[PDB]
Amino acid sequence: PKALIVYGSTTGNTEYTAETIARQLANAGYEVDSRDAASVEAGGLFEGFDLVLLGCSTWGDDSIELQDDFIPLFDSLEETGAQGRKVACFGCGDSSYEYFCGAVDAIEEKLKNLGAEIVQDGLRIDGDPRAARDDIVGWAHDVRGAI
Ligand SMILES: Cc1cc2nc3c(=O)[nH]c(=O)nc-3n(C[C@H](O)[C@H](O)[C@H](O)COP(=O)(O)O)c2cc1C
């Protein structure tokens, strides 16, 4: 079908992760449009995608702070056309720090009550994803059998 990926990556782990998801999708005979996020503007941004994939790294340590590029999107996730949209979420973190991938936890909270349809619990990556490469591949594959 037609899937979307918006991601926020500060050092690249979340980016690696997404392109891994994206090559696996496309390879599944999809249509995928992958974006960095910084170049996305809320304004009906999900509107025409079959599947939408949000994904978010986490910083702050003492509090949960969304990856810099992600905040504005997040703040306008209302203007996206989230309602009734098919969505899944994925992000990178460290089991260390208290709030282990809160950004993830937040983003979910808010499109489910935005009316979005969480098709699968999301990917919470501990450490280097290159080290959890097949685990994305498993998930990516899991989002595929949900819809
Ligand atoms: C100062 C600092 C704070 C961090 N806080 C968290 C955190 O609260 N939760 C988490 O899962 N990871 C935390 N991390 C680890 C990052 O999430 C990790 O670098 C992540 O894999 C980066 O993904 P990215 O390169 O797409 O931004 C923190 C890292 C630093 C340097």
- Spatial distance between the Cα atoms of 36 and 67, rounded to a whole number of angstroms: 12
DSSP sequence for the chain: -EEEEE-B-SSSHHHHHHHHHHHHHHTTT-EEEEE-STT---TTTTTT-SEEEE-B-EE-SSS-EE-TTTHHHHTTGGGS--TT-EEEEEEEE-SSSSSTTHHHHHHHHHHHTTT-EE-SPPEEEES-GGGGHHHHHHHHHHTTTT-
Q: Where are the domains of the chain?
A: 1-147
Tokens of 1: 């079908």
> For residue 67, which atom of ligand 1 is closest to its CA?
27
Residue identified by tokens 């599947």 is 51
The structure was resolved to a resolution in Å of 2.0
**Determination technique used:** X-ray
Rg, C-alpha atoms of the chain: 14
Contact call for residues 13 and 92 (beta carbons, < 8 A): yes
CATH code for the part of the protein at 1-147: 3.40.50.360
- Name the residue of 66, 71, 97, 136 whose CB sits within 8 Å of the most ligand 1 atoms, as the mutation to test its pocket: 97
How many CA atoms does the CB half-sphere of 114 hold within 13 Å? 23
Distances (CA, A) of 54 to 62, 85, 96, 129, 133: 23, 12, 23, 17, 18
